[PDB]
Every structure is written in C-alpha cells, then in structure tokens.
Design a protein around this ligand. Structure first.
Ligand SMILES: *[C@@H]1O[C@H](CO)[C@@H](O[C@@H]2O[C@H](CO)[C@@H](O[C@@H]3O[C@H](CO[C@H]4O[C@H](CO)[C@@H](O)[C@H](O)[C@@H]4O)[C@@H](O)[C@H](O[C@H]4O[C@H](CO)[C@@H](O)[C@H](O)[C@@H]4O[C@H]4O[C@H](CO)[C@@H](O)[C@H](O)[C@@H]4O)[C@@H]3O)[C@H](O)[C@H]2NC(C)=O)[C@H](O)[C@H]1NC(C)=O
Ligand SMILES: *[C@@H]1O[C@H](CO)[C@@H](O[C@@H]2O[C@H](CO)[C@@H](O[C@@H]3O[C@H](CO[C@H]4O[C@H](CO)[C@@H](O)[C@H](O)[C@@H]4O)[C@@H](O)[C@H](O[C@H]4O[C@H](CO)[C@@H](O)[C@H](O)[C@@H]4O[C@H]4O[C@H](CO)[C@@H](O)[C@H](O)[C@@H]4O)[C@@H]3O)[C@H](O)[C@H]2NC(C)=O)[C@H](O)[C@H]1NC(C)=O
Ligand SMILES: *[C@@H]1O[C@H](CO)[C@@H](O[C@@H]2O[C@H](CO)[C@@H](O[C@@H]3O[C@H](CO[C@H]4O[C@H](CO)[C@@H](O)[C@H](O)[C@@H]4O)[C@@H](O)[C@H](O[C@H]4O[C@H](CO)[C@@H](O)[C@H](O)[C@@H]4O[C@H]4O[C@H](CO)[C@@H](O)[C@H](O)[C@@H]4O)[C@@H]3O)[C@H](O)[C@H]2NC(C)=O)[C@H](O)[C@H]1NC(C)=O
Ligand SMILES: *[C@@H]1O[C@H](CO)[C@@H](O)[C@H](O)[C@H]1NC(C)=O
Ligand SMILES: *[C@@H]1O[C@H](CO)[C@@H](O)[C@H](O)[C@H]1NC(C)=O
Ligand SMILES: *[C@@H]1O[C@H](CO)[C@@H](O)[C@H](O)[C@H]1NC(C)=O
Lengths: 173, 320, 320, 173, 320, 173
C-alpha cells in the first residue's frame, strides 16, 4: 500500500483476530491478550460497502435492440450491425477491466491507510510514555495493568498520570 | 519481555485468501473478494414478471398472417415474443421484402389485436384456398388475408377501395401480391395478364408488378406470395387499387402508441421461476453487474463483457 | 492554559456545504462544488456565430424542388438549416424513395446554388402547370422542374439528352417520374402508355417505370410524382432517356466539395443571442462539459448524458 | 481521507478562517490569534484548478450526425439508428459518473494530504521544543512571543535558540 | 559538521526529464516516460504472417466475374485482399445493385474457388463475346459468365434449369441481366421484347425486368449489365427461369463456413517485412496500445485515437 | 505527491545517484558517501512495470469491419457508418486520455510514497538515537563509523548498543 503498514512495517496479519479487521495485542505483568478495535474496522467496512453499493446498482434496462446473430452473410447492413455490437462489447469490457483494477488499488490503499490511522491514534495517546519499536508495537515505559491497557484501547488513557515515571525510565533521570 | 509493557497493533488474516488484479499487480492476495461477472444461467426462461408469449410452431410473421398453427396467438400480448427455431411454414410459400423490418415492427408493437373490416370487392371471387395451406385436413389460407381471383364469368374488373382512419390509433395493414409460375396460371387466376397492385396513403404509395416464373416446388406449388405492409396514421386513409394478383387484407392490426416489446429466438423452455433478465440461453438471476453468458439479453440485465472473471476485492491484503 | 504556548493547525469550514459523490460514499459534504451537467437552455436559437437559415413554411426538400413558398431559399447558404414541423406541401403531391437520403445530402451540402441549363427537348410540350401547385393565385409548378407532356399533334418522341460535367464541381440533378391515376390519363398526357424514364452516368443508371392507379385525393389530384437524384462528378456526364412521364430538371445544384452543414427540425424561434451550441429545444450557453437537455445537439456542445446532476468537489470536506 | 487529518485527528474546521484554506491558531502569554497559511492553500487551490481546467476543455464539435427522433416505426435501419445512439449515451453517462466519483475521491484525499503536510512541516520546525497534543495542536515548551509565533508561521523559527529551555521544561532536568 | 554524524535519504534525478500530464497538472516533469501512441508506419504492407493477395489491376468484384486482367486470382485465398485504387474495368460495362454488399461478401469469404457446372441451355446461342471486353486481342467476356442469345432460327425458348445443392458447403452463384440500349437491340439479341429473369431458391426469389434505353458510351457500348447473386444453402436448390436477357453463371463459388477475411483498398506496395497490423497507409510494427495513423486498420492493431501523443510516466518527479 | 517527500521535505533529487532510484548519503568522522537502497528501488520499479504490463497486453484483433471513407455523399446508411465510427473514436480517445492521466497521478504518488517509506524505516531503526533535521536527513547523536553506517543501510543497526551515548548527547545529562 501507499502507507507501508499492511504488507509493510507490520510484517504479517493475525489469524486469531476473528471479531475485527484491526486490533490490539498486549503483554503486561498480568499476561497477554488481544481485542478488536471497532472504530477502525467499521470505517474500513463502510468504505468498502460504499463501493459495493456503487456497483450493484442496476440501471441498464433494454427491450427492443438489434439482431446479434445471423445464419448467413448478407452484406452491408449486417456488417454494420455486427460492428456496432462488437464496438459496444469492447468498450464495456474495457470499462469493467479498468473499474475493477482502479477499485482494487484503492481498496488496498484504504485498508492500509486505516491500519496506519489506528497506529497514529495510539501513538498520539501515548505521548512521551512509550516508544515505537518499529513493527506496529509500542514499548510502554510504565507499568500498565489490564485497566490501563483497556484505557489505551478505549481512548481514555491519560498520559499525564504516568508521564514522570515513564520519562524517568525512558532516559534514566 | 524485559518488564516494560508492550501493545501491538495489527490486522486480521486468513489461511488462504483470493487473488485480485490491480493497476500495479496482475495477481495479489486479499482476504475477501466478490465476483463481478455472472457466468451461470437457468436452463429455463422465467414467465414472471415479464409477459412471455411462446410462438410454439409459429414464427411471429406467420402468427401475424394467421397461418394454420397460429390461432393460439390471436389476441396475444407480450413483453417478449419467444420464437422457436423449429418453427416451420404451414401455408402458402411466401417471402417478405425487408423481412426483418416486418418482424421488428410486429415484435416491438407487442400485440396481435386484429380488427376485421369488410372490404366490398366487386365481381371477383373471394376466400381462395390452397392445398399448400391445410387447416384441419382441408384446403385453407392465411386467416388475415383474402385471396381474390376472377369470377366464373372470366372478369376481374378494376378494384378501387378506401378505408379511412377516423379512429384513435395507427393501423397496420398486411397485404400481398401473388406471383404465378406461368402466364397461363396468371390468366387462369386473374384474366388480366400483367396484373397490378397499388396501395397508397396520403403521403406514401407502394406499387408492385407480379413476377411470373417457375420457382422450386414447395408444398405442391411453384408460385409465391410477397407480403407488404402499410401503416395508416389517424386522419390518414388507405386505398387498395388492383387489376389482379392482390392478396387482400381482412382488416388491420392495432398498433400501440408506445412500442416497448421485443422478440427472443431460442429453444429454451418456459419454466416457473422468477427473473427480469432473459438470454437466448435462459434467464439469469444475479445481482452482479456484468455477465459473460450472452450478447442477446433482454430486460434488467448485467452488461455483457468478454471476461470470464473479474474479482472485486472486499478486504485488505492477506498476509497469514 | 498552564503557560506553555500552543499552536494549532487547522482548516476552514462553512455553515453549510455541498454534497458530492465519491467512490466510497454516495453523499458526503464538501465546502464548495461545481455542477457539471448543464440543465438550462435559452428559449431561442442564436443566429451567431453559426449561419442559420430558417425554412419558414418550406421543408429542405420542397426548398430544393422550388415549391411555391420557397423563393426566399434561392441562393441560401447555411451551417444549420432550421426546418419547421409546421412546414406544409404547397405543390404537386410527391414522394421521394429514400427520402431521408435526399434530405441528408441537401442539408449536409449547405447551400442552394442552382445553375440553370437549357435542355433541348424535342416536340413535347414543356412547362406543364397544375391546380395542385398555385403560385400567386395561378396554376404553376416546382421552379426547378419542367413537366413535359405530349405535343398538340399527339406525339411524344423518344427523348435522349446529354449534359457533360466539364466543370470544377460535382453536380446534383433532381428529376422525377409522374405516376398517372388511370390508363387514360397516361395516354392523355404522354401518348405512349407504358412510359419509361432512364437516367444514367458512366458508372450508374437509375431506371423507372411509372405506376398507374388511383391514390388518395390531395389538392385536386390522385396522381403522384416520385423524385430521384443523380450526382455527376467532374469528367462524368448524364443522359436523360424517356418516352413519357419524365419531370425534367431545369439545371443542377452545385455540391460543395467539403460538406459540413446540417439540419435541425424545431419550432424554436431565431432570436438575437450568441452561442455555438444548438438543440431542438434551443441554444445553450455553458462551459459545463455535460448536458441533459437533448440528444439532438449541433455545434460545440457538451456531451449528452442521462444524469440530471453531477457535482465536482472543488474543496475539502466541510466539518463546521 | 487517506491521511486522517481532515475529519480525523483534526476534529473540525474553522468558520473564522476566511482568507485561507489552512491556517494557524495560537495562544501565548501575549494573547490568541489566527492567520492563514498561503503555501498550503495555494498548492491545494492549484491542484483543484488543474482538474477544473482538464474538464472545461471543450473538444467535441459535431455537425451532421444521424436522425435521433422518429414519428413512426420503420423497421431495421431505424432500430439500428436508435441502438447506436442509446449505446453512445449509456457509455458517455458511465464515463461522466465514473469521472466525477474518481475526481471527488482524489480531491478529498489531496486536501487531507495538504492538511497533513502542513502539520508535518511545523513538527519538523519545532524539533524537540514542542510536543504533538494529538488534535492538530503543538504544546511549546518555551515562552513564545508574537514574533516567535510568526517565525514559526513564516518558516524562520530557529529551534536551537530555545532548545535548552524547552528540553529542561519537557523533562525537568 | 559539528561532529554528530548525518544520514540523508534522497532519490535520483536527471538533468532534463520528460513532461507528462496528470489529473491535476497539464505538464509536470518526471525522470522517464514512455510514449503510448504509435505515429510511425512502414511504407510497405508486410506479406507475413497474414496472407495478402494483390488484386493488381482487378477489383475484387471484377476478380469474381473473371474479367480479362484477373486470371491470377483464380484459386486465390487471402486473409486480406489488397485492392488498388488504380484498378480499372476491362470488360462489359456493368453495375451491381447493393455493390458494397457483394464486395463485402466476396472479401469476407476469403477465397475464389470456382466450381464449374454445365447448364443445359436449350436452343439459345451460348458464349457470347463483346468488343468491350478484349482478351489477348480478341472479343471475349467474363470468364464466369455465359452470355446467352437467340438462335440462328430467331428462337429464344423459355429456359428453366435447376441445380441442387447436395454438397457440404453453401454456394454463391453470380448472374446478370442485360439492359439493351434500344428495342431493336432487345429483339435482335433475345427475340422476345420484354425479357425476363427469375432466379429463385426454396425460401427466396430475386426477379428482374430489363430496362431499355441509351446510356453513356463506355468501351463501345451504350448497353449495360446488372449483376446479382444468390446463396444456395446445403439442401436448398436454385432455379434459373428466363425468356431473355440472362447472363448465365458457369458454376458457383465455394463459401467458407467461417468467414474471417477482409479487404483493404490502398496503393501501398507489398514488401518483405513482418507485421500483423496493416493500415491503408502501410503496416505498423509496435508495442504501443494506441496509434494515430489510420482509422482503417486490420489485424492485431493498436486502438485508433485522435491524440498525437500520450506519455505514460515510468519514474518519479524530476527535480535536478 | 500525497506524501510531501519528493518535491516536498526532500527539496531536490541527486544526479549522482545512478545505480538506484533511492539511496543514502552520509557524513561521519571518516568521510562522506552515497549508496543505493535496493529494496525501495526494486519495489517502485516492480509497481511501475506492472502498469506497463497491463497496457502492452494487446487484445484487439479485428478483420472484417465497415467501410470508413467514401468518395461521395450517399445518404442515410453512409451517415450511420460515419457516425458509428466517429462515436467509437471519440470514446476510445477519451479512454486513452483518462487512463494516462490517472496512471501518471498514481505513479507520482507511488514513487513519493516509496521515498517516505524508506525515510520512516530508517527513523524506526534509529529509535531515540537520532533526530529528523527536516530535509530528509537524520542527525545521529553517537559516533558511527563506516560499519555502523552500513548497518543502518543494511538494516542490522542495533539501537541499544548506542542508546546511552546518544541520549546523553541529545539532552546533556
Ligand atoms: C421448371 O423447373 C422446375 C424445377 O426443376 C420444375 O419443377 C418440378 O416440377 C415437377 C412437376 O410439377 C415437380 O414434381 C413434383 O414433386 C413432388 C415432390 O418431389 C420429390 O419428393 C417426393 C416426396 O415429397 C418424392 O417421393 C419424389 O420422388 C420427388 O423426388 C411430388 O410430390 C409431386 O407429385 C405429384 O405430381 C406428380 C406428377 O408430376 C404425380 O406423379 C404425383 O403422384 C403427385 O400427384 C399429385 O397430383 C395429383 C393430380 O395432379 C393429385 O390427385 C394428388 O393429390 C397429388 O397431390 C411431383 O412429382 C418437381 O418437384 C419440381 N422440381 C423442383 C426442383 O421444384 C418445373 O416443372 C419446370 N417447369 C416446366 C414448365 O417444365
Ligand atoms: C377510387 O377511389 C378513390 C377513393 O374513393 C376515389 O377518389 C375520390 O375521388 C373523388 C372524385 O374524383 C374525390 O372528390 C373530391 O373531393 C374533394 C375534397 O373532399 C372533401 O373535402 C371538401 C372540402 O375540401 C368537402 O367539401 C367535401 O364534401 C369532401 O368530403 C372535393 O373538393 C372535390 O370537389 C370537386 O369535384 C366535384 C366532383 O367530383 C365537384 O362537385 C366539386 O364542386 C369540385 O369541383 C371542381 O371541379 C369543377 C369542374 O370539374 C371546377 O369548375 C371547380 O373549380 C372544382 O375545383 C371532389 O368531391 C374524392 O375526394 C376522392 N376520395 C379520396 C378518398 O381520395 C376515386 O375517384 C376512385 N376512382 C374511381 C375510378 O372510381
Ligand atoms: C443518345 O444520346 C447518347 C449520348 O449523347 C448518344 O451517344 C453517342 O453515340 C455516338 C454514336 O453511337 C457515340 O459515338 C462514338 O464515340 C466514341 C468516342 O467518342 C469521343 O472520343 C473519341 C476518342 O475516343 C474522340 O475521337 C471523338 O471525337 C469523341 O468525342 C467513338 O470512338 C466512336 O467511333 C466509332 O463509331 C463512329 C461512328 O459513330 C466511327 O466514325 C468511328 O470510326 C468508330 O468506328 C467503329 O465502328 C466501325 C463500324 O461501326 C468499325 O469498323 C470500327 O472497328 C470502329 O470500332 C463513336 O463516334 C458517342 O460517343 C455517344 N456519346 C455519348 C456522350 O455517349 C446516342 O447516340 C444517342 N442515341 C440516339 C439514338 O441518337
Ligand atoms: C464464462 O466465464 C466462465 C468463468 O467463470 C467460463 O468458465 C466460461 O467458459 C465463460 N463462458 C464463455 C462462453 O466463454
Ligand atoms: C435535467 O436535469 C434537471 C435537474 O438539474 C431535471 O430537473 C430535468 O428534469 C432533467 N431533464 C430531463 C429531460 O429529464
Ligand atoms: C500523429 O501524431 C504525430 C505526433 O506524434 C503528429 O506529428 C502527426 O501529425 C499525427 N498524425 C496525424 C494524421 O494527425
């Protein structure tokens, strides 16, 4: 993708994450765990559902057209009827091919972008209390029991509570 | 673990995904995809919501002329006339100059509503019948046509008859010209040897001279009929003028003012399912926007495309 | 405030924006948009910069033949011939086989520049006139045509006349064949009963036999004229060979070598504005690339599309 | 958008910003203020004007075409003429719909990207002297009078002048 | 340098790049680009891998009739018939109603494979020859046609001949009707004065009456021939019925069941290069997907577009 | 571009970099140097060649079509033949124009994105040992001989070896 998160600095996906598209994995004193992030998952699903809705929107209702099969050669007018229908088919096939290629490029970029926006949200919450380890993970420089982990997941983590502990451990002062 | 807590952000994956195409990659793996090209069809045509009329053994043209196997089409109305490739001619051997135009007008108009009119032909014999056109097991003729011949007294006087369209709708008259196989058949049937048929309205006139000669034998005969048509708008009128060889109409078909019907030529049976999209290969029920089943599609249909497959990605890259 | 300075980066917004479509959202709000589909037209046709000729009560075809109401079109040149649906026939009742072709050639050519040529018809009377074709209040005929009939001595000799194109430009000859209503009108006018008209060039020959019979009464008559045309390239020549029923040309129209004009059939008056895009509903003055006004557009026009509205975003998302 | 700045970590727009598309708001000891950023605004306006130029570029000049309305049914050739014109209209309508959808997606992404590039420019100027508060705002860890605010706005802020003050306030050393 | 190491990330550049167009910029500079519109063509047509047959001085139609300069086309098979604009008629002056249809059928079918059949015409003289159609230096005729005229005893009896298609392939029969310049030429050649030609199958019948009159002199003559064609499907049969003016076939051409060939009209010489894309301006050898060389392209060709240049970027922005 | 790296915070390209599209330039005590980055260069080349592959993939083989030029006027059917062919040409020309515009927009974004991903990879490697100077360059706060430079280039730099040195230089403790 354009953002280099999926298939990038996050090295693989998680087969265990079954109730979300994006999520958190943690290890603290009390153990490990994983939960889904609902906001990122829903925004990516809504954008993809939007493109689906844009396509399965059938407005192409035709009744009396032209003949399209001929048992024998007839000359000028049959040549024109065949040529018109071949021209139409070639243009519609080009449109289908290009639409799918563009949409897929964009869908891959959108999902990579949503991965990246989640990473940046957590970064901005942690402020000076954590460091980016380089693989989608943050090293947190204060103890963080299960309630503190959930506070990070649910967006109520207050960095100021932990800042001086974390800064002292980060830099040894 | 060192004892500093870690939080990792990530994304899901599945053991095996689906490959899709993009602008930069011919095949790249994603978690979910959706196929956009319908390839499967029902082996039947569905009779709802569109009104389908099955011609069975009658062509639409033979159905308009009223040939023997076609009485079930009297009064019919359709969105799609289903024409069978096993249809055969059952009556007088005929041709239609600009055949496809008559077929298209009939199919597009969408109904066989015939209004009988009495034509007061004078002296000539009427209701001629033929061995080439058996009904029950007896010589007969097209239902909608009246084959005029000379009287027992060997007269075929000039015929000159008018019908005025003082009604609400455009009228379709189908008429014919008999082409005998010899000169003596010409005089035997019509007295006058160059016959002559002229059919005109205010603004148009089609005029026809018969062609005499031996054609291949079909159902007993080497003579032929050529059929023509004339549309009469409200306020206009039609004149039939002949000194022989006219195969006269018995009335006219009503034309709908909005023409939205069509014809489909296929051997596929009519079943009992529901679908608003038909092909010559059968109906299709799909929400996909494209299809590779047939060029020939009628109704609320996906667009026919060349590709057998186009996968829309509906998820992220799959990296298990 | 705590006493550490703060700097915030941000973006503008407005109370209420415009909703637009994207690949992923049907309607999402942005600060400004611009409509790309022109929906408004003037109730006039604009006579600049394109040259518009108003047929008034004359068809383009009647203008070429020189029917009574058409003298104002002598010598006219146009980019767009404006033909009126209220046009009426004012002369001998006629038809044109392949009418739309004659109309398309005349409209595309873009001018009525008639070159008179004196044709040395022999014995036959010339300049026949008709009650069906009054000019001032007197029997007359098409201006560009010369109705030949048999002499006072009851003779119509074979006519065999040639005109050579040794000039610079292609020539358009318009000629006709008279169809009498009876045999006796045929002999009354032309002596010979099967008339015959053959008009040929080096490489082409159109040949015609008259059709005799009663058609509906129009302006006094049940006879008809059928009109034909022949293009004579430089270096080629034309031969008129007839023994009755020819309605002779009086000359030929000049064909431009570059044919870039057309025709519009509409009731919209010609006004005083400026625009190089015309529809059957009136001109349009717009910079938008699309329009939903009409299929029928001439000049430098937006592309006709089905959608009533397509808004292009010209700003960011609006979040007030 | 792909970048998550507009309609993202920047929570809303400013109705008071009337002479630019993007700008700065500050609070310091001397008071508050707002000014527009001309470079961000002009680059976004120029990109959008470019797409407008690409569209209002009328190259489609047609005179003699085909007949497109018919008083009555005629048969084979009239059917072909109707079918040709309906094929043309459906293809052009599809092109208009897809063009506008694509252009709008891209215009939204372009304007969101310019918001983000302005944010990242300011971040790089501030170096170690300020911290990202998480909502498009920077907390500056030295006093910054109006001249210092404008120096940040006009790209002449020298972080080294304030670095030692700022680092001592950030970490308490 | 201060003494802290520095690492800089950057990207390449070149002194001068190529400018390309984007959605937002009409011209912006990139490191490398590739042109997508082919503008160059070879000045020859390449005779490989597609089979090209050069008509030289013969039309495809004159090649079908067997006019003097066309013997090199006996037995030919082609993917593309190369027809030359300097082709001239070398035989009896003729026309073809719906000429372009006969030419298209012949070109598409892809071969001239003639099957001789002996037709047992009775009484009539056969093998008529003409000054308008010299072969070697002697009066001759089209190779595939048999000009029948009245016998030494002044008889032209009714001719009524049948050929049955019991073979494997559809047959194309090409026949004609002679149009004399006078009545006395008509009787001199055919005895009966209105001649008559009727050619029919089971399902179709084309019938023709000759037109008498003086046309422009071409290679000695003011008479003409009109050519027609009839396709006879397997199981069907053809009947020739005439009392004068038939220019009879000498057999039939074989029609391929798959019609895949075409015709190109150009003066460009055939050389010795290799290419599967031909235009009326010459072949093109290219990988580009578009071309602005010609509308008229045959084979495996780039798509014809209006633009002279479309540059695809293949590198980053160039900032030197 | 969307990312503001090329033609953005990196102010120009390097004419001397001839064996890659992206690379590193360094200065340390032992001198200066420049080397190409193979991974970023190869990913950008592969994406661009993929679009090339999608275009030079020619599937458009036509033999018997319609007549396309005419010596003189003929009427209705010739008008229809001209109109069908001119409609086809206009639609194909629109597709060519839009394809190249879209592809070039995307190619410029792809290469700018690859520049940015290289920059962010190195940033994550350096952790707390370096600071972004704002122009594509990192100031490194420990001595880094030629082997340590190459370790940054080849992705084997261990930040923990130098962290104490660098943090002390960065903040003076
Ligand atoms: C100009 O050239 C044409 C073309 O060649 C030529 O046409 C041929 O005309 C003859 C005579 O008119 C046609 O002969 C008829 O053919 C049919 C069918 O033929 C084949 O198929 C049947 C099965 O359907 C096979 O069994 C058979 O062997 C054939 O190969 C026959 O059905 C016809 O039979 C009737 O008439 C015969 C006399 O000719 C009788 O012998 C026979 O019993 C049938 O009797 C009918 O008539 C009785 C009174 O007439 C009546 O009481 C009965 O009810 C019964 O219906 C007949 O053999 C031949 O098919 C034509 N060929 C083609 C290719 O069209 C023209 O004749 C010629 N013109 C001139 C003036 O010479
Ligand atoms: C084959 O079949 C066709 C169709 O039936 C038939 O055509 C009909 O021919 C008759 C006579 O030839 C036509 O009669 C003429 O019709 C017009 C107009 O008709 C209507 O509208 C008028 C108003 O415009 C109403 O007032 C009227 O009631 C009609 O409903 C009349 O204008 C004609 O009148 C002239 O001729 C009459 C004699 O027939 C005179 O009585 C009358 O005064 C007019 O006289 C003219 O002649 C005088 C000397 O001759 C002269 O001094 C005057 O200046 C004056 O101009 C006439 O009634 C009828 O319309 C045709 N019908 C159709 C449908 O076309 C063919 O005749 C028939 N062929 C054969 C051989 O039978
Ligand atoms: C109806 O209207 C048409 C059209 O106007 C008219 O057609 C003209 O017919 C005449 C006579 O049939 C045609 O005359 C022939 O024209 C050619 C070529 O003409 C021009 O070009 C030549 C050079 O090619 C110039 O030198 C010349 O000046 C012309 O401008 C001539 O080649 C013909 O010559 C032969 O016949 C002459 C007698 O008419 C002889 O004098 C001459 O020597 C040629 O002799 C041939 O015949 C001999 C016996 O017949 C024989 O022994 C020889 O072997 C030799 O082959 C001739 O002059 C004229 O071209 C037609 N014009 C057009 C425009 O088509 C019809 O005649 C008219 N119908 C009626 C009934 O009047
Ligand atoms: C339609 O596509 C399917 C692939 O889903 C393929 O199997 C089938 O052969 C295609 N039909 C035709 C007629 O090519
Ligand atoms: C054209 O679009 C407008 C909306 O802008 C709509 O009101 C109008 O009805 C449309 N025209 C037609 C003929 O549908
Ligand atoms: C085709 O394009 C080239 C530019 O590459 C241009 O020079 C040439 O004139 C064009 N051909 C035509 C016929 O316009």
């Amino acid at each position: 993708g354009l953002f280099g998160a999926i298939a990038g600095f996050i090295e693989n996906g998680w087969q265990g994450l079954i109730d979300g598209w994006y999520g958190f994995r943690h290890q603290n004193a009390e153990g490990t765990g994983t939960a889904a992030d609902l906001k990122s998952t829903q925004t990516a699903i809504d954008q993809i559902n939007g493109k689906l809705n844009r396509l399965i929107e059938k407005t192409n209702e035709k009744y009396h057209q032209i003949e399209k099969e001929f048992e024998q050669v007839e000359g000028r007018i049959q040549d024109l009827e065949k040529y018109v229908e071949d021209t139409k088919i070639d243009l519609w096939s080009y449109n289908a091919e290009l639409l799918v290629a563009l949409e897929n490029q964009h869908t891959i970029d959108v999902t990579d972008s949503e991965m990246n926006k989640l990473f940046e949200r957590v970064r901005r919450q942690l402020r000076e209390n954590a460091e980016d380890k380089g693989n989608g993970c943050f090293e947190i420089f204060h103890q963080c029991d299960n309630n503190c982990i959930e506070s990070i997941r649910n967006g109520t983590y207050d960095h100021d509570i932990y800042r001086d502990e974390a800064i002292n451990n980060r830099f040894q002062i | 673990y060192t004892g500093n807590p870690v939080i990792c952000l990530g994304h899901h994956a599945v053991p095996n995904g689906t490959m899709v195409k993009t602008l930069t990659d011919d095949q790249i793996e994603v978690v979910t995809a959706q196929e956009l090209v319908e390839s499967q069809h029902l082996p039947e045509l569905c009779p709802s919501p569109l009104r389908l009329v099955d011609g069975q053994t009658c062509d639409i043209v033979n159905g308009a002329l009223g040939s023997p196997g076609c009485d079930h089409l009297n009064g019919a109305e359709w969105d799609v006339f289903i024409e069978r490739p096993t249809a055969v001619d059952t009556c007088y051997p005929f041709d239609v100059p600009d055949y496809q135009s008559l077929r298209s007008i009939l199919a597009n108009n969408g109904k066989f509503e015939f209004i009988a009119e009495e034509f007061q032909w004078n002296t000539v014999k009427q209701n001629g019948k033929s061995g080439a056109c058996k009904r029950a097991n007896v010589n007969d003729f097209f239902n909608r046509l009246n084959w005029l011949t000379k009287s027992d007294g060997n007269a075929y006087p000039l015929q000159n008859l008018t019908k005025v369209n003082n009604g609400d709708y455009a009228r379709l008259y189908i008429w014919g010209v008999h082409h005998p196989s010899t000169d003596t058949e010409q005089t035997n049937l019509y007295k006058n040897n160059p016959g002559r048929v002229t059919v005109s309205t205010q603004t148009s006139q089609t005029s026809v001279v018969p062609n005499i000669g031996s054609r291949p034998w079909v159902r007993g005969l080497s003579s032929r009929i050529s059929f023509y048509w004339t549309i009469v708008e409200p306020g206009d009128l039609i004149v039939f003028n002949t000194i022989g060889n006219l195969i006269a109409p018995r009335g006219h078909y009503k034309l709908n003012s909005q023409k939205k019907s069509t014809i489909l030529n296929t051997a596929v049976p009519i079943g009992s399912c529901v679908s608003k999209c038909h092909t010559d290969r059968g109906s299709i029920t799909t929400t996909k926007p494209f299809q590779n089943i047939s060029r020939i599609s009628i109704g609320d249909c996906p667009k026919y495309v060349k590709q057998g497959s186009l996968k829309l990605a509906t998820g992220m890259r799959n990296i298990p």
